[PDB]
Amino acid sequence: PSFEECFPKSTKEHKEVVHEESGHVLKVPFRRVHLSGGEPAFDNYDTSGPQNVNAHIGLAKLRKEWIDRREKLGTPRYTQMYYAKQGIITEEMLYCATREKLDPEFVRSEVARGRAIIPSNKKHLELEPMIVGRKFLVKVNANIGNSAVASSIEEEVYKVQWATMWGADTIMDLSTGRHIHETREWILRNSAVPVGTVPIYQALEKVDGIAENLNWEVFRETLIEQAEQGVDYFTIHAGVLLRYIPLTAKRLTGIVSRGGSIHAKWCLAYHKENFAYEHWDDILDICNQYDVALSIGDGLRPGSIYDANDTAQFAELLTQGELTRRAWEKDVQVMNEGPGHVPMHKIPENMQKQLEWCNEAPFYTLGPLTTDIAPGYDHITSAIGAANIGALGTALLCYVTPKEHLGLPNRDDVKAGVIAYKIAAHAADLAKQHPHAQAWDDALSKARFEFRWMDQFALSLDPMTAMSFHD
Amino acid sequence: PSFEECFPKSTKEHKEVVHEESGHVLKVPFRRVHLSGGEPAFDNYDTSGPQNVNAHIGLAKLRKEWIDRREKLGTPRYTQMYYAKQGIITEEMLYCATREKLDPEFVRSEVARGRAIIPSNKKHLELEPMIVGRKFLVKVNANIGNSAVASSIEEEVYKVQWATMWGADTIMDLSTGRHIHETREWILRNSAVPVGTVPIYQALEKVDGIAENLNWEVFRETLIEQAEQGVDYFTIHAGVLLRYIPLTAKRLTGIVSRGGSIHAKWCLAYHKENFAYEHWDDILDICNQYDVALSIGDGLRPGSIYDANDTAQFAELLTQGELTRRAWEKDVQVMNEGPGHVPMHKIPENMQKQLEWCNEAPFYTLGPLTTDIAPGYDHITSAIGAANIGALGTALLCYVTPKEHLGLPNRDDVKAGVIAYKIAAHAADLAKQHPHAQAWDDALSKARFEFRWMDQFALSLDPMTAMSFHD
Numbered sequence: 001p002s003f004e005e006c007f008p009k010s011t012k013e014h015k016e017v018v019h020e021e022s023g024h025v026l027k028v029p030f031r032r033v034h035l036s037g038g039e040p041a042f043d044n045y046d047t048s049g050p051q052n053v054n055a056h057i058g059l060a061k062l063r064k065e066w067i068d069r070r071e072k073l074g075t076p077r078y079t080q081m082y083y084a085k086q087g088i089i090t091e092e093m094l095y096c097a098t099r100e101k102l103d104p105e106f107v108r109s110e111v112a113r114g115r116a117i118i119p120s121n122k123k124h125l126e127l128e129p130m131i132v133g134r135k136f137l138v139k140v141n142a143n144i145g146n147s148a149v150a151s152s153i154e155e156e157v158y159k160v161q162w163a164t165m166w167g168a169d170t171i172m173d174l175s176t177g178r179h180i181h182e183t184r185e186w187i188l189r190n191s192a193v194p195v196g197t198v199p200i201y202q203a204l205e206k207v208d209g210i211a212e213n214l215n216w217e218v219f220r221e222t223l224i225e226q227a228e229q230g231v232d233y234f235t236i237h238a239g240v241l242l243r244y245i246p247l248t249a250k251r252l253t254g255i256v257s258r259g260g261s262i263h264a265k266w267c268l269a270y271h272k273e274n275f276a277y278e279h280w281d282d283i284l285d286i287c288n289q290y291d292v293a294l295s296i297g298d299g300l301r302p303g304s305i306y307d308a309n310d311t312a313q314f315a316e317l318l319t320q321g322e323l324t325r326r327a328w329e330k331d332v333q334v335m336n337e338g339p340g341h342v343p344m345h346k347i348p349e350n351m352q353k354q355l356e357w358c359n360e361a362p363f364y365t366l367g368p369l370t371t372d373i374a375p376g377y378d379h380i381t382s383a384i385g386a387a388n389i390g391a392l393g394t395a396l397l398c399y400v401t402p403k404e405h406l407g408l409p410n411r412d413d414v415k416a417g418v419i420a421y422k423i424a425a426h427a428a429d430l431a432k433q434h435p436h437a438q439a440w441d442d443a444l445s446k447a448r449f450e451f452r453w454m455d456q457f458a459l460s461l462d463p464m465t466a467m468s469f470h471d
Numbered sequence: 472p473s474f475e476e477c478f479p480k481s482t483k484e485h486k487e488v489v490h491e492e493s494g495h496v497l498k499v500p501f502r503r504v505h506l507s508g509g510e511p512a513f514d515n516y517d518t519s520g521p522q523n524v525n526a527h528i529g530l531a532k533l534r535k536e537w538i539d540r541r542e543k544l545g546t547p548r549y550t551q552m553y554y555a556k557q558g559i560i561t562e563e564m565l566y567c568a569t570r571e572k573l574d575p576e577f578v579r580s581e582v583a584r585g586r587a588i589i590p591s592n593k594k595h596l597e598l599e600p601m602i603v604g605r606k607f608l609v610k611v612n613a614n615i616g617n618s619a620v621a622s623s624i625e626e627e628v629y630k631v632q633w634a635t636m637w638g639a640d641t642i643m644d645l646s647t648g649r650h651i652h653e654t655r656e657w658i659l660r661n662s663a664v665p666v667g668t669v670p671i672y673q674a675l676e677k678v679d680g681i682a683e684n685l686n687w688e689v690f691r692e693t694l695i696e697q698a699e700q701g702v703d704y705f706t707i708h709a710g711v712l713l714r715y716i717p718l719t720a721k722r723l724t725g726i727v728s729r730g731g732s733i734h735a736k737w738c739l740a741y742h743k744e745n746f747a748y749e750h751w752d753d754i755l756d757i758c759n760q761y762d763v764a765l766s767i768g769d770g771l772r773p774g775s776i777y778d779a780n781d782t783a784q785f786a787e788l789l790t791q792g793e794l795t796r797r798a799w800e801k802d803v804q805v806m807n808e809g810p811g812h813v814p815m816h817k818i819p820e821n822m823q824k825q826l827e828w829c830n831e832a833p834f835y836t837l838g839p840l841t842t843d844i845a846p847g848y849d850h851i852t853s854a855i856g857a858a859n860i861g862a863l864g865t866a867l868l869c870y871v872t873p874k875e876h877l878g879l880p881n882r883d884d885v886k887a888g889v890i891a892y893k894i895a896a897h898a899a900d901l902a903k904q905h906p907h908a909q910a911w912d913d914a915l916s917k918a919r920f921e922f923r924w925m926d927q928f929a930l931s932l933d934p935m936t937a938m939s940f941h942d
């Protein structure tokens with residue numbers, strides 16, 4: 001369906017601002033919901049990106065002049081953190097500031113201090129910049145993966161188009177098997193939102209699924225390949241240390257992280273330290289040339305309520321903080337990945353320890369799921385946890401669909417997950433008293449009170465569901 | 472569908488215990504989930520009630536000998552609170568204690584002090600007793616209403632059967648229009664769970680929808696009619712005082728409570744104090760003869776995030792506490808109704824004030840909805856709030872379906888609402904570290920880890936959804 005079909009009475013708009021240092025004109029997307037009865041139109045965030053673009057051609061390379069100008073000026077490092085620490089407000093920073101209705105200097109400050117990141121690989125020229133950080137709107141990530149068999153470019157690109165239509169702020173391409181490189185190229189050239197990956201997945205594919213045949217060298221080659229395409233952030237499980245693995249022996253559900261499992265298998269096979277940890281500095285050198293942000297994985301994530309907040313989980317968290325501070329020494333942007341399965345009373349401890357041990361780097365959670373009892377409904381069990389941990393400061397929420405623990409999500413499942421997570425994210429924005437967040441609730445509630453039905457539906461997260469249910 | 476179809480590998484069971492004082496044998500329901508691989512069967516709560524019973528005959532009158540014996544002994548008041556304060560452990564108390572795996576004296580103590588209620592009108596002989604209170608499992612209420620046109624007894628009774636099959640602990644019959652008395656009779660004779668009502672709805676129908684023609688007398692007659700049938704609890708909006716009505720003038724969504732609106736209209740028409748407030752003592756006299764519990768309504772509930780925790784809402788809460796203490800002086804069981812629409816940061820204040828101002832009487836919330844932005848998904852927006860406020864001590868959660876704000880729920884909508892609320896309730900049980908609550912999560916997670924797929928599905932809230940999604 002088209003944008004207009006998904007969001008009746010809404011139009012795509014852009015706010016034009018000038019980047020003072022370069023003279024570059026930025027066109028920052030938003031949506032406008034047109035209302036009745038003398039109400040002013042309501043302006044809202046928009047991640048849906050350019051519409052009706054031929055996937056064989058790809059999106060406009062909107063960042064090209066920004067990247068070209070900085071290259072011509074010359075620079076030792078290419079990261080938003082490097083520029084921020086030099087006192088430079090970049091186009092990306094101004095774009096995010098405009099998008100967030102906040103001051104560009106505030107954005108620069110948050111990025112410089114490591115409390116926000118702008119995942120924006122210089123090779124992802126199609127990207128509409130966005131920011132992740134506790135001082136900003138809570139963001140949502142959706143995961144995609146290519147088809148088991150050969151699919152068309154239209155079919156692959158629709159996965160990003162659909163997730164972002166419903167509000168996904170980032171996506172990750174978690175493809176395995178064949179065609180990883182080719183389909184990721186299709187995604188990046190056609191994605192207006194940041195695209196992350198977990199590079200160890202493709203590295204494992206390069207060695208035919210034999211974890212014991214992994215090593216730094218094939219991982220390094222994989223990082224460069226993905227960076228060259230434009231991947232904006234890498235999940236890297238560098239905190240799964242050899243000595244932490246035995247801490248999982250008494251767990252109910254062991255190591256549930258896919259990347260964590262792979263590293264653990266390699267570590268145990270050789271009794272050697274995690275190669276991503278050992279080569280952390282070399283990873284930073286790669287990231288600095290492209291601006292790939294590092295999402296430090298939580299390979300020792302709890303996979304059951306029983307395992308929540310255990311010794312293994314927090315051992316890794318402590319190391320995530322060390323790795324964070326090391327990355328910042330080289331001006332590499334960082335966020336930290338978090339749980340997982342966590343009952344509600346254990347959520348505050350997670351945020352307290354992360355904020356302290358990781359120097360307020362942005363936190364990126366998978367839920368958490370607040371109970372294990374409802375497979376088929378884990379978008380709900382985890383929306384509860386995501387809203388809670390978002391309220392306490394978590395900056396990015398990885399979605400969970402109704403098919404979690406069960407199977408691959410179809411389009412209905414993906415939409416259900418994104419909607420549930422947009423609810424959690426906005427509920428968290430309200431809880432944080434984020435500026436102007438309540439204006440959205442107020443506009444819909446005013447429409448409800450005044451029986452402006454179409455306006456109520458048009459203002460909601462999913463207008464056609466509301467309208468259909470009413471009919 | 473049958474119990475077996477809804478819960479494959481589960482059997483309905485009963486734990487037999489003897490009430491020492493009377494010699495009465497109680498058969499307390501539970502379910503048993505039969506597992507594989509040498510796992511012991513897992514025993515869980517069961518509200519589904521007796522299966523395959525002809526609705527034209529009705530359920531067994533299991534409480535008859537209990538009520539008959541107490542009548543023969545003679546008593547001035549018939550409430551569980553009266554008996555508890557006399558030091559008597561009743562069959563109802565022992566039944567609830569067994570059902571909750573807690574001590575009968577503990578149950579008696581909680582009821583005597585007003586911190587738990589056992590809604591159990593002596594005329595509802597079909598009832599399998601249950602308890603509502605912060606020291607017990609968090610409970611869920613589902614609402615039903617009779618058909619707009621003439622429906623069969625099978626069709627009406629299926630509404631209760633369906634809601635309880637998925638875990639509803641109480642129901643309320645909120646029917647309006649024609650046939651209110653007749654269909655409520657069908658429900659009560661065929662309901663194993665407590666049945667509540669909002670008596671002002673039928674009182675309004677008796678005066679042909681003209682609120683100005685209400686008065687104490689027609690309300691009183693309605694209370695007696697409903698009590699005689701066996702209604703276990705009444706929502707009564709006695710805290711909507713005349714002087715509180717102007718406090719709503721600056722609200723965004725005014726008075727959203729149906730009962731509250733009716734009382735407000737009458738109060739404003741005559742400039743006279745709420746007649747349910749004025750006749751509170753007379754209401755208590757009725758309740759004492761049947762054991763009808765009072766659910767003190769929140770007619771000044773906030774209906775939008777904008778109105779949350781405002782002066783009007785808390786003025787009524789203060790009065791709810793006064794009414795609670797007055798009811799206890801006459802040994803009438805009480806719970807208090809709460810919000811509503813409340814953003815997450817405002818939830819703790821709601822619980823703090825209720826616990827203090829209402830002397831820890833059980834709290835009964837409608838959600839709360841944590842954001843207004845997602846009509847069509849208000850089971851999710853409110854599951855977040857319900858889980859949170861449940862974790863802080865709320866004892867009964869009134870469900871919200873995906874059709875909230877939009878239309879009448881079908882069977883799929885009702886199931887979705889009950890499931891979402893069972894998730895919230897159990898998540899709250901975990902957060903409170905309620906004894907043995909985590910054993911359920913652990914059993915499912917162990918099955919997951921060990922690839923015992925059927926066991927995983929059988930242990931879940933909705934086995935056939937999990938199984939189908941996996942397939």
Ligand SMILES: O=P(O)(O)OC[C@H]1O[C@@H](n2ccnc2)[C@H](O)[C@@H]1O
Nearest residue numbers: 172257258259337338364365366398
């Ligand atoms: O390889 P593992 O299982 O750790 O990661 C799977 C996915 O989960 C996401 N995630 C987010 C927080 N913790 C894990 C991560 O970014 C990736 O999308």
Ligand SMILES: O=P(O)(O)OC[C@H]1O[C@@H](n2ccnc2)[C@H](O)[C@@H]1O
Nearest residue numbers: 643728729730808809835836837869
């Ligand atoms: O008449 P009003 O709208 O107050 O009540 C509608 C329903 O909402 C329930 N409720 C629960 C808490 N507050 C309200 C109440 O028990 C009844 O089922």
Ligand SMILES: [Fe+2]
Nearest residue numbers: 256303341405
């Ligand atoms: Fe999981």
Ligand SMILES: [Fe+2]
Nearest residue numbers: 727774812876
């Ligand atoms: Fe509402």
